[PDB]
Amino acid sequence: LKAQALAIETEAELQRVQKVRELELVYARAQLELEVSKAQQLAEVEVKKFKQMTEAIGPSTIRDLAV
Amino acid sequence: LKAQALAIETEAELQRVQKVRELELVYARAQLELEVSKAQQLAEVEVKKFKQMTEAIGPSTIRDLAV
Numbered sequence: 027l028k029a030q031a032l033a034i035e036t037e038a039e040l041q042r043v044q045k046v047r048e049l050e051l052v053y054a055r056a057q058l059e060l061e062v063s064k065a066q067q068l069a070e071v072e073v074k075k076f077k078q079m080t081e082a083i084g085p086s087t088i089r090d091l092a093v
Numbered sequence: 094l095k096a097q098a099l100a101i102e103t104e105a106e107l108q109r110v111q112k113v114r115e116l117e118l119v120y121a122r123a124q125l126e127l128e129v130s131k132a133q134q135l136a137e138v139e140v141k142k143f144k145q146m147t148e149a150i151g152p153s154t155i156r157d158l159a160v
Contacts, residue, residue, distance in 0.1 A: 038096035042103045049107060053114050060122055064129070071133040078140045082147045083155070090156045 080088070147155070 034096055038099055042099065045103065046107065049111060053118075056118055060118070060125065063122075064125055067129050068132055071129070071136050074133075075136040075140055079143050079147075082140075082144045082152070084152050087152050087156055091159070
């Protein structure tokens with residue numbers, strides 16, 4: 027009889043753990059694409075701002091700011 | 094019976110956690126585009142202000158301010 031109750035509460039527990047973790051995995055990957063969305067989109071403003079003012083000086087004079 | 098009540102309060106809890114986090118994800122990505130909106134738009138005033146006064150000196154004389 028002690029094994030019957032161990033099966034009942036094991037069935038109950040795994041129904042919950044499964045139903046929880048599967049739903050938490052949806053939230054986990056939504057945070058990811060939002061994280062990736064940020065890192066790549068702030069990397070655009072970094073590159074483009076570097077590219078604009080790298081040509082203003084010119085890639086012929088920038089070699090003469092640390093000699 | 095203890096497993097019935099564990100299913101009832103697990104169903105209740107996950108209905109809330111799901112409904113909360115899904116709505117918080119909307120606010121989370123609205124803060125992002127506003128963050129990206131700032132970083133790129135203040136990077137314009139930085140580049141353009143650098144570009145205007147980089148030509149005033151001229152990219153032929155700026156090499157002679159640290160020799």
